[PDB]
Design an enzyme around this catalytic site. Structure first.
Site, PDB file in Angstrom:
ATOM      1  N   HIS A   1       0.444  -0.950   0.091  1.00 24.80           N
ATOM      2  CA  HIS A   1      -0.502  -0.324  -0.255  1.00 24.80           C
ATOM      3  C   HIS A   1       0.407   1.066  -0.165  1.00 24.80           C
ATOM      4  O   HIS A   1       0.534   2.634  -0.675  1.00 24.80           O
ATOM      5  CB  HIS A   1      -1.004   0.283   1.320  1.00 24.80           C
ATOM      6  CG  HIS A   1      -0.407   0.420   2.417  1.00 24.80           C
ATOM      7  ND1 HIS A   1      -0.332  -0.421   3.333  1.00 24.80           N
ATOM      8  CD2 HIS A   1      -0.110   1.482   2.727  1.00 24.80           C
ATOM      9  CE1 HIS A   1       0.908   0.328   4.197  1.00 24.80           C
ATOM     10  NE2 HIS A   1       0.888   1.906   4.321  1.00 24.80           N
TER      11      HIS A   1
ATOM     12  N   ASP B   1      -0.216  -7.547   2.963  1.00 21.96           N
ATOM     13  CA  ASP B   1       0.551  -6.012   2.020  1.00 21.96           C
ATOM     14  C   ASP B   1       1.782  -6.068   2.249  1.00 21.96           C
ATOM     15  O   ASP B   1       2.539  -5.563   2.729  1.00 21.96           O
ATOM     16  CB  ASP B   1       0.188  -5.126   3.368  1.00 21.96           C
ATOM     17  CG  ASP B   1       0.105  -4.108   2.621  1.00 21.96           C
ATOM     18  OD1 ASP B   1       0.481  -3.820   1.904  1.00 21.96           O
ATOM     19  OD2 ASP B   1      -0.015  -3.437   4.362  1.00 21.96           O
TER      20      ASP B   1
ATOM     21  N   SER C   1       5.175   2.681   8.181  1.00 22.24           N
ATOM     22  CA  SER C   1       4.572   1.509   7.250  1.00 22.24           C
ATOM     23  C   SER C   1       5.804   1.056   6.170  1.00 22.24           C
ATOM     24  O   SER C   1       6.757   2.359   6.196  1.00 22.24           O
ATOM     25  CB  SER C   1       3.251   1.735   6.463  1.00 22.24           C
ATOM     26  OG  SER C   1       2.169   2.149   6.904  1.00 22.24           O
ATOM     27  N   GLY C   2       5.573  -0.046   6.875  1.00 25.94           N
ATOM     28  CA  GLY C   2       7.097  -0.458   5.037  1.00 25.94           C
ATOM     29  C   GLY C   2       8.309  -0.921   5.891  1.00 25.94           C
ATOM     30  O   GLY C   2       8.873  -1.896   5.392  1.00 25.94           O
TER      31      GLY C   2
HETATM   32  S1  LIG Z   1       1.403   2.811   8.347  1.00 27.24           S
HETATM   33  O1  LIG Z   1       1.560   2.983   9.007  1.00 27.24           O
HETATM   34  O2  LIG Z   1       0.727   1.416   8.053  1.00 27.24           O
HETATM   35  C1  LIG Z   1       0.013   3.682   9.207  1.00 27.24           C
HETATM   36  C2  LIG Z   1      -0.354   4.276  10.351  1.00 27.24           C
HETATM   37  C3  LIG Z   1      -0.577   4.486  10.851  1.00 27.24           C
HETATM   38  C4  LIG Z   1      -1.136   5.949  10.140  1.00 27.24           C
HETATM   39  C5  LIG Z   1      -1.392   5.882   8.853  1.00 27.24           C
HETATM   40  C6  LIG Z   1      -0.495   4.543   7.541  1.00 27.24           C
HETATM   41  S2  LIG Z   1      -0.893   4.657   6.230  1.00 27.24           S
HETATM   42  O3  LIG Z   1      -1.469   3.693   5.388  1.00 27.24           O
HETATM   43  O4  LIG Z   1       0.665   4.684   6.117  1.00 27.24           O
HETATM   44  F1  LIG Z   1      -0.931   6.209   5.711  1.00 27.24           F
END
Ligand SMILES: *S(=O)(=O)c1ccccc1S(=O)(=O)F
Ligand SMILES: *[C@@H]1O[C@H](CO[C@@H]2O[C@@H](C)[C@@H](O)[C@@H](O)[C@@H]2O)[C@@H](O[C@@H]2O[C@H](CO)[C@@H](O)[C@H](O)[C@H]2NC(C)=O)[C@H](O)[C@H]1NC(C)=O
Ligand SMILES: *[C@@H]1O[C@H](CO)[C@@H](O[C@@H]2O[C@H](CO)[C@@H](O)[C@H](O)[C@H]2NC(C)=O)[C@H](O)[C@H]1NC(C)=O
Length: 218
Positions: free
Chosen positions: A41, A88, A173-174
């Protein structure tokens, strides 16, 4: 990362920053000199031809000679579900190979199907939000977390910090989840907002994708 501490410089030399116009937006992991893995994502609805893959970073606000910068050459996804956030994970082949040194290293992954039980101690990391109205962190952060199996799908690895509000947030994220020296997770999503103290953080379960990963990076 909400509620963590500064990582020491290059403590995690497999840690990768994915950037647009010199701006961090997602984490990733070096899994071969010319491949990284991150969350699917993260690169969805993004111009991947413009993304820079930054190795050996520590402080996002400084000029850092230890960095090695690459571009994305090939994209691999295996049944990514953008609605439920199933599978994901994305593998990104780089336009070249990293020079492996003290600051830039290839992560170790677990064996296929390897499962972590409740209570196992891990380390999460990333340049994400430091908290509400605080912005993303300049300096790489790390956070002691604990694997839990409550409020977690069998298709995720979930973690929670006990006793206080702490967790990964936007920008994390990632980023790798490290348990006993191996990458078991890729930060995928939060619930009830960041650091809710109620919902565990969810990671893509790297161990379930090991055969697939190997078939790509050889
Ligand atoms: S991501 O770390 O999963 C994430 C965490 C908290 C808010 C948004 C996101 S996002 O989906 O990457 F935007
Ligand atoms: C907080 O976490 C650190 C780091 O965790 C270990 O190393 C990570 C890379 C990952 O593999 C985790 O699963 C591991 O748990 C802990 O530091 C370890 O501490 C012990 C002493 O208790 C020491 O013998 C080890 O050498 C340390 N390992 C490293 C890599 O520094 C620390 O204990 C944790 N503390 C709490 C309160 O959770
Ligand atoms: C892989 O792609 C990167 C991405 O641009 C290349 O890096 C740059 O290298 C050129 C040298 O020709 C510099 O002028 C740029 O300033 C660099 N850009 C960044 C963002 O650092 C790299 O050369 C490519 N490597 C191979 C082997 O093709």
């Amino acid at each position: 990362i909400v509620g963590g501490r500064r990582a020491r410089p290059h403590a995690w030399p497999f840690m990768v920053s994915l950037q647009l116009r010199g701006g961090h937006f997602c984490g990733a992991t070096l899994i071969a000199p010319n491949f990284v893995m991150s969350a699917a994502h993260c690169v969805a609805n993004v111009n991947v031809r413009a993304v820079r893959v930054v190795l050996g970073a520590h402080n996002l606000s400084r000029r850092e000679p230890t960095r090695q910068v690459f571009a994305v050459q090939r994209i691999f996804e295996n049944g990514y579900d953008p609605v439920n956030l199933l599978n994901d994970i994305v593998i990104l082949q780089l336009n070249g190979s990293a020079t492996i040194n003290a600051n830039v290293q290839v992560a170790q992954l677990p064996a296929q199907g390897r499962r972590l039980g409740n209570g196992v101690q891990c380390l999460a990391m990333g340049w994400g939000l430091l908290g509400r109205n605080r912005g993303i962190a300049s300096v790489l952060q790390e956070l002691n977390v604990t694997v839990v199996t409550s409020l977690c799908r069998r298709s995720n690895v979930c973690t929670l910090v006990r006793g206080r509000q702490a967790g990964v947030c936007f920008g994390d994220s990632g980023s790798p989840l490290v348990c006993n020296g191996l990458i078991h997770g890729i930060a995928s999503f939060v619930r009830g907002g960041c650091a809710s103290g109620l919902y565990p953080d969810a990671f893509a379960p790297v161990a379930q994708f090991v055969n697939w990963i190997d078939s790509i990076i050889q």
